[PDB]
Amino acid sequence: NKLEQIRNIGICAHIDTTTTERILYYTGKTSAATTCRWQDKVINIIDTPGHVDFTIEVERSLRVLDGAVAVFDGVAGVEPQSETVWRQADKYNVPRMCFVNKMDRMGADFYRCVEMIKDRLGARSLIIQLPIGIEENFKGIVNLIKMKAVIWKDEYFEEDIPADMQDKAAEYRARLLDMVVELDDTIMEQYLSGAEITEEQIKILIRKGTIEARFYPILCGSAFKNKGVQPLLDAIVDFLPSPIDIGIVKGIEVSTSEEKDFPISIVEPFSALAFKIMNDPFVGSLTFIRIYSGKITSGATVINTVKNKREKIGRMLLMHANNREDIKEASAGDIVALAGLKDTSTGDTLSDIDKQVVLERMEFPEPVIELAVEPKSTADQEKMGLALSRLAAEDPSFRVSTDHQTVIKGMGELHLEIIIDRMRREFKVEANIGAPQVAYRETITTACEIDYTHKFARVKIIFEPLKDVIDLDKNKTFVFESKIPKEYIPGVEKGLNNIRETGVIAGYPMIDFKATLVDGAFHVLAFEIAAKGAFREGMQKGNPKLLEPIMKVEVITPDEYMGDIIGDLNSRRGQIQNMDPRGNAQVVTAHVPLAEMFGYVNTLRSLSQGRAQFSMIFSHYDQVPSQVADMIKAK
């Protein structure tokens, strides 16, 4: 089966020639993904670096790849940057191997680095290699599976383990076997009875253990001096999962909103996730997708289930080390680039029309952070619009609005920082940005009726906080209903919708309420004036209250910092929801008001020596305390 021959991988390395360069040279004899071959497998190397700190992109990278190679600086050991990615991989139980690099550099200490992998990361390490020679003398590795040394001259060759290392080699051989036979009772009895265990036997258990994330095979080498890359390639093919081994992709069936495990299979309907959009001067914008089921041929019609818009498959490309290949068909397991797509963003799902699925749940929360923009001069206004809209399509969680001064709206600081930067740099737009503003909201607490007359039209309307209504069939923030004296019912809606943006307390939009038009009168046209007065006066009678965005904060930290981290979260009016041990770390889940989260990236770093990490998504609105409610009515 073609599907079992695939290896979808990331190479996670803190940029030191690099390991990935050596990988790419050996298969032949810049891209979001590169496809190459080793032994009898097709390897798809996902470029894991990106924003590198955005969080969303890192998790999306981890769902596209199926296994990972974690590369550790042989001289530095385990570094904060590598810990934090390793923790994210723990989240998804990504099958992983460790490659201890730079074994030729001054101070390179394989065994110190293995100790940090075991200690700092709490990873169960399966050492299948030992280094031969220290620093400048590093010459190769002892393969503990074959019990043989592999040496590189300056050509290479496999020989008996060097004499002065037979003690270490034979001791690690055992430690390996004790780890490996824990996954089977029969071979366990075979190893206990004294019989020799075959290499093929050992490779199978190592593979099972690696795929189930029971342990992590450790390898070493030197990409600089070009030593150890071939065995790493062999271990990638031998031990990292195929998409068959993953078995399922998680998602939602669109018609039912039911979450589901979708089987990875070519005979099931087509589905794919776009993970990077890359601009190319020769072929235009490329959308890289990982296909999880079904097939697409050029000319097929699929549907973008996040945008709910059809797309047509035109050009399809495979990226190799130094050439692109036009292909006319792609199928489950493949990673390919599509050209000329109309409106598809990273994170979007492309699906069969007959069965629509979404693979990355994409609730589009109302923006929490708002920024005022003024173009530098009257000229750039043309560039100031085309650029901000070209980016609001590539990213739907960003919005731009205008008051009949333009305003941009995002979901967090770093999110807006990246946009403003691409705005001035990539698009040569010159403008001036104001200071951020929290997107406060307003609601009513109690039901309130009001008969309002303008002169001459008169409406009589009941306002109700949705939490108390006795109806429904959907879930909108503002609900309209008219149990009516007039055929002008459309006129009341327009007025009510236009003015709720301007709330009664302090100018913020009113949300979470029904408005029931009951009875009226007439004598002209344009009832919006009266419906506005009803709202403007009525809503003061429903005990209106200011609302602030509350964020779901998820902090992954090593236990020693959690006391400080939790105390700081509570100083931000945060409320801890849960703690779960993951390895030797803790996952803290909290609700914190966005207003108290500015600069948390840098605070968390200084509180955890760089070893903690966090993610933040909009949770809900709730009422603001008295002290801040006065702080908001200040302006």
DSSP per-residue string spanning 419-449: HHHHHHTTT---EEE---EE--EEE-SS-EE
Which of 102, 172, 103 minimizes the C-alpha distance to 132?
A: 103
Report CA-CA distances (Å) from 233 to 8, 40, 60. 13, 12, 24
From the CB of residue 84, how many other CB atoms can be counted at a distance below 10 Å? 20
CATH 3.30.70.870 fits 393-440, yes or no: yes
The pair of structure tokens assigned to 353 is 């029309």
| Run of H or E residues at 327 | strand 324-327
Q: Where are the domains of the chain?
A: 1-246, 264-360, 393-440, 441-547, 548-630
Question: Which residues face 12 on adjacent strands?
Answer: 70
Cα separation, 20 vs 27, whole angstroms: 11
379 is in an annotated binding site: no
Helix, strand, or coil here: 634? coil
Tell me if domain 393-440 and domain 548-630 are identical in fold. Answer: yes
For 227, 435, 444, 630, the CA distances from 633, given in Å and listed in that order, are 66, 18, 17, 5
DSSP string, 598-611: TTHHHHHHHHTTT-
Q: How many CB atoms lie within 10 A of CB 60?
A: 19
Distance, in Å, from the CA atom of 530 to the CA atom of 491, rounded to the nearest integer, reads 10
- Please provide the CATH number assigned to the domain covering 441-547: 3.30.230.10
Q: Is 103 annotated as a binding residue?
A: yes
Q: How far apart are CA 423 and CA 332, in angstroms?
A: 37
DSSP 582: E
d(CA 602, CA 464): 43
1-246 CATH, one of 3.40.50.300, 3.30.1360.70, 3.30.110.30, 3.30.200.190: 3.40.50.300
User: 219: which 2 tokens?
Assistant: 């390898």
Q: Is 451 annotated as a binding residue?
A: no
Q: CA-to-CA distance for 143 and 149, rounded, in angstroms?
A: 6
Buried b (16+ CB within 10 A) or exposed e, 38-58: beebbbbbbbbebeeeebbbb
| Residue reference for tokens 């695939």 | 6
Q: What is the DSSP letter of 549?
A: E
Cα–Cα nearest to 221, from 402, 332, 100: 100
Spatial separation of the C-alpha atoms in residues 556 and 583, rounded to whole Å: 11
Resolution (A): 2.4
Q: Does 396 appear as a known binding residue?
A: no
DSSP state of 117: H
Nearest to 488 by CA among 448, 454, 517, 455: 517
Among the listed residues 524, 529, 535, 540, the one whose alpha carbon sits nearest the alpha carbon of residue 454? 529
Query: Token pair 């009832």 is at which residue?
Result: 527
**Of residues 620, 437, 438, 441, the one with CA closest to residue 544:** 441
Among positive and negative, which fits the CA dihedral 168, 174, 178, 181?
A: positive
Q: How far apart are CA 10 and CA 13, in angstroms?
A: 9
Q: Is 231 helix (H, G, I), strand (E, B) or coil?
A: helix
Residue 104 annotated as binding?
yes
The single residue listed with the structure tokens 């691409």 is 422
Q: CA–CA separation, 602 vs 68, rounded Å?
A: 28
DSSP state of 332: T
H-type alpha helices, 240-380: 243-246
Nearest residue to 581 via CA among 122, 213, 179? 122
- Quote the CA–CA distance of 8 and 67 in Å, as a whole number: 6
Determination technique for this entry: X-ray
Whole-angstrom Cα distance, residue 596 to residue 429?
Answer: 31
Find out whether 527 and 492 touch, Cβ atoms under 8 Å.
yes
Q: Which two tokens stand for residue 373?
A: 């923009």
Please check if 490 is assigned to a binding site: no
Q: Which CATH architecture has domain 548-630?
A: 2-Layer Sandwich (3.30)
The alpha helices in 312-412, defined as continuous H runs, are 381-394
Q: Of 554, 564, 563, which is closest to residue 606 (Cα–Cα)?
A: 564
CB atoms within 10 A of CB 284: 11
Pairing status of strand 271-280 against strand 284-293: antiparallel
CB count in 10 Å sphere of residue 579: 13
| Cβ 550 vs Cβ 593: under 8 Å | yes
Cβ count near 601 (within 10 Å): 16
Sign of CA dihedral 257, 299, 284, 324: positive
48 is in an annotated binding site: yes
Give CA–CA dist 139/220, Å, rounded. Answer: 11
Tell me how far apart the alpha carbons of residues 73 and 79 are, in angstroms, rounded to a whole number. Answer: 8
Instruction: Quote the tokens at residue 429.
Output: 């737009």
- CATH fold, domain 264-360, is Elongation Factor Tu (Ef-tu); domain 3 (2.40.30)
Q: Residue 551, annotated ligand binder?
A: no
Rounded Cα distance between 293 and 441, Å, is: 42
In whole angstroms, what is the distance from residue 443 CA to residue 439 CA? 14
Q: What is the DSSP letter of 4?
A: G
What are the backbone angles phi and psi of residue 499, rounded to the nearest 5°? -90, -20
Cα dihedral 467, 473, 475, 477 in deg (nearest 10): -70
Range list of β-strands (E), 47-135: 67-73, 96-101, 125-127, 129-132
Q: Say if residue 51 carries a ligand binding annotation.
A: yes
263: left (phi over 0), alpha (psi -120 to 50) or beta: beta
